Amino acid sequence: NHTNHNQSSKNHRNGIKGPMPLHLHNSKRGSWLPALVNARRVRKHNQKAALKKRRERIAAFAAKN
Amino acid sequence: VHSYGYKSGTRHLFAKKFRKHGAPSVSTILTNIKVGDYVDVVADSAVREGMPHKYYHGRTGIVWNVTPRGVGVIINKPVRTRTLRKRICVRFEHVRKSRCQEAFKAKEHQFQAYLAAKKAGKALPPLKKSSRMGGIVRPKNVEVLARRV
Amino acid sequence: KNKAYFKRFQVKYRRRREGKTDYHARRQMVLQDKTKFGSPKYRLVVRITNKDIIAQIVQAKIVGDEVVMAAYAHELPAFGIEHGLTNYAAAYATGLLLARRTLAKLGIADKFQGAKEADGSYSAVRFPFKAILDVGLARTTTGARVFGVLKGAVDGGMAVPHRPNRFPGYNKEKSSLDAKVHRDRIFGKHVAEYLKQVKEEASSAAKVLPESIEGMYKKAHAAIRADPSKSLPKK
Amino acid sequence: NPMREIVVKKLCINICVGESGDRLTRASKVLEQLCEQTPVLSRARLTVRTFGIRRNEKIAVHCTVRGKKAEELLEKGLKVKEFELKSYNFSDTGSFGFGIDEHIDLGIKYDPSTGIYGMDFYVVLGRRGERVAHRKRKCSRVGHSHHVTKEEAMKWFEKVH
RNA sequence: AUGAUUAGAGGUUGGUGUUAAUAUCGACCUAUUCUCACUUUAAAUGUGCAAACAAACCUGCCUUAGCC
RNA sequence: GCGGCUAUCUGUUACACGACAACGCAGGUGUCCUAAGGCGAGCUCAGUGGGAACAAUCUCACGUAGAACACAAGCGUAAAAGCUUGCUUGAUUAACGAUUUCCAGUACGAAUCGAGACUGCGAAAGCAAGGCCAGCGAUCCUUUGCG
RNA sequence: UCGAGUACGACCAUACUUGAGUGAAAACACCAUAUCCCGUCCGAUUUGUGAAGUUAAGCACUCAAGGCUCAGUUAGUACUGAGGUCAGUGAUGACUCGGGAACCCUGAGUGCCGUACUC
Ligand SMILES: [Mg+2]
Ligand SMILES: [Mg+2]
Ligand SMILES: [Mg+2]
Ligand SMILES: [Mg+2]
Ligand SMILES: [Mg+2]
Ligand SMILES: [Mg+2]
Ligand SMILES: [Mg+2]
Ligand SMILES: [Mg+2]
Question: For residue C231, what are the CA distances in angstroms to A1, C103, C108?
Fold first, then answer.
């Protein structure tokens, strides 16, 4: 006995939770490789840069302090 | 529950409109999509290779993926007590670049360019005027109303 | 007609109902992978007509197909014999005449050496300026002026990809570097077999020297690489 | 007046013999010199089969002749039948033709090893400007409102005859 | 319109009751007709989205994947 | 209880997103194709309106699909996706990566977007990992391949 | 030499298709030919190759009808969301608070623009 009655009011008790925003689980994975294989190598460099930018900081913040 | 195929109950939904059939546009082939813009997933027939399921027809959503000839679109789907960000894979012809933001794309384009004109800009050209207020209105034709039979 | 037919009649695409464009070939040429976001795709749409020929490099734009650097065979006669307009070699003539001025319009001076001036059996393309060939509705019978302009372009710095499977020198095995190099420059025995003996029978392409007609083009080839502008004298 | 004149496009003499075999064993050969262009066949879809022909079977030994070589071979459809048939054969568009049960009625010879076939020199006149109604590129209409008609037919029917 | 559903006004195609002259009902031919499922971006009610501190700018990185 | 259908497919039910039931209605399925697959080119179908020794077919008109598309039905397609021909095996391996539908967001089945080869058909852009979407099967066991 | 002319097009009938009119330069167009690649059973189609020629078709320009597009109605009509301890009849009917058609008919007009060249 199919009814669908009380179901729309069950889905709205604890609320129909809104979707997660885009900054949640934005895993550009399973997508088109030639993009993510480039958006990978550019992440490696931008991490060598993030590590390098902190290296001068501390060393500038040492001598210049 | 005899039939629930991938294309069920969709006679009028995928049917082309009246006197507009045949091949897809050259605009729809010359569109330009990025990862992130919005797209109306308006599944048209006459391509019949890459149409999404019925559900994702009036639906618009982010492009999370642009393969060579398939746009990947996330779409919010209110399943039962939560929405899934579905990840559909369709071809480009089933896709419009969604206007849904020209409402403030074109607003803040001239709204700021005049807020700047109003804040700093160069000058402040007067803009749209007031809408709802009073007034001693002068009539131009009197009338009455009783009946018409 | 008459009635309720032209009510539900759908008018076909405006060029198609009467005109040239083929909107199953149109939509497959200008089409490009949606990854390469607005990367320019330049065609090589060439049209042979009866009196003349028309070849211009086109990219499709949303505003309408934006032609860049059109080049005809009514401007090469301002540097050539003007005795053969639809000549297979005249196709080759405008082939590089189109191929050159694009590089002169693209500022491309490095690959502007192009290819060798002499007719080649075949060349393999990729770095250089690239385009795709649009015959339109002109067919692809082995040998055609839509294809002299092709090889005329490719031998002139264009990267219009092609195989030899449909060249006049091509036969059941490969492409004859002898059977082509003639037609690409001249095969004037078409006049020294009938039109030379035209007076030898009775009353009847005058002024033509079948001893220079071949060289009458080899003058124009090396000139194009020197005079790309080569516009017909206006005014 | 220059291009306003009519000239027969093609006289595709059609033979419609029965089912294939030794029935069409000499038809094409003695039809290889009436026009010098190889005769054709006709793969049938209906093939009523009361004559014998079935689906996709060689029955109608088609041909096709045009140009000046047909205009001259029209002087045989205008040789026999007293060079004039009934004006009730003028088509709605201006086509007409002759034909006899005697193949050897022409300069042909009813050789012994061949059955007594014939031909049907059904020709179709038409002015210049029909090469615009069918073009693989840049088509158009038939070029209506100036063409051959059942009245202009009986003009050139007995003008060039 | 895909179909209708059909009789009312009379006139190509079959059989036929007639004295090359005539109908006769079907098919048809017409102006229609009657009232229905098939038709049309044709509602109301709906529903998908977006709407302010990086969604626009003025800029500048780096690998340059794209394109010469 | 006999009778008949549980796995599935289209329309309808079904109410203009989606969802939606009934031994609820109407129909189909458990296949069939080395071409009825793939591609390129050429062509335009059902019908009709008239025409030719024989007498169908060659004639040209007008022909928005009234046909065809392996089949049920519905969408869809007209310089084709149908018709004819050509050349072919992409109906293959797929590093399978992701996704869709059923959904519990689990299989399965069928699809969609890809990647890597190796390829075929094309002058080319492109098209093809079957014939769209029904046509199918866990643990264990047997069995072959894999080295 | 100026509007348009071809060829490329984007919207896709205001653009369609009809009976004509119209074509002044060019430019398309039919046109000549099997002397070659070519594939035509065919010089039809196309595909070698050019200009005796021709506006006869084609094509764009003009009017001027179905159809199409825009509106005036149609009509606050039908229909509809909501509300009655509304009224009867279990037929929808009106009301109130709103949304609000269509077919038709009387109209309006019967394409528009965008890149190169050429004049
Ligand atoms: Mg809501
Ligand atoms: Mg089927
Ligand atoms: Mg069927
Ligand atoms: Mg396909
Ligand atoms: Mg399932
Ligand atoms: Mg699976
Ligand atoms: Mg299947
Ligand atoms: Mg396919």
Answer: 84, 16, 20
Residue C160 burial class via C-beta count within 10 angstroms: exposed 0-12, middle 13-18, buried 19 and up: buried
The bases of strand F with some atom under 7 A from any protein CB are: 6-14, 17-22, 24-28, 41-44, 49-62, 64-65, 74-81, 95, 97-102, 104-105, 109-116, 122-128, 132-134
Count other C-beta atoms under 10 Å from residue B28's C-beta.
Answer: 19
Question: Where in chain C does DSSP place strands (E)?
Answer: 43-48, 53-59, 66-72, 132-134
Q: What resolution (Å)?
A: 2.8
Distance CA C185, CA C199 (A): 26
Name, in order, each residue with C-beta under 8 angstroms of A40's C-beta and a sequence gap of 6 or more: none
DSSP B10-69: -HHHHS-BTTB-SSPPSHHHH----SS-EEE----SSS-SSPPPGGGSS-EEEEEEE-SS
Cis status of the peptide bond prior to B119, with omega within 30 of 0: no
| C22 touches C110 (CB < 8 A) | no
For chain B, helix, strand, coil in percent to 5 are 20, 20, 55
**Amino acid (one-letter) located at B98:** S
Q: Return residues with beta carbons within 7 A of strand E.
A: A 19, 34, 38, 41-42, 45-46, 49; B 17-18, 38, 40, 58-61, 75-76, 78, 83, 98, 100-101, 103-105, 107-109, 111-112; C 4, 7-8, 36, 39-40, 106, 108, 111, 127-130, 159
3-state secondary structure of D18: coil
Of C67, C148, C166, C153, the closest CA to residue C111 belongs to C153
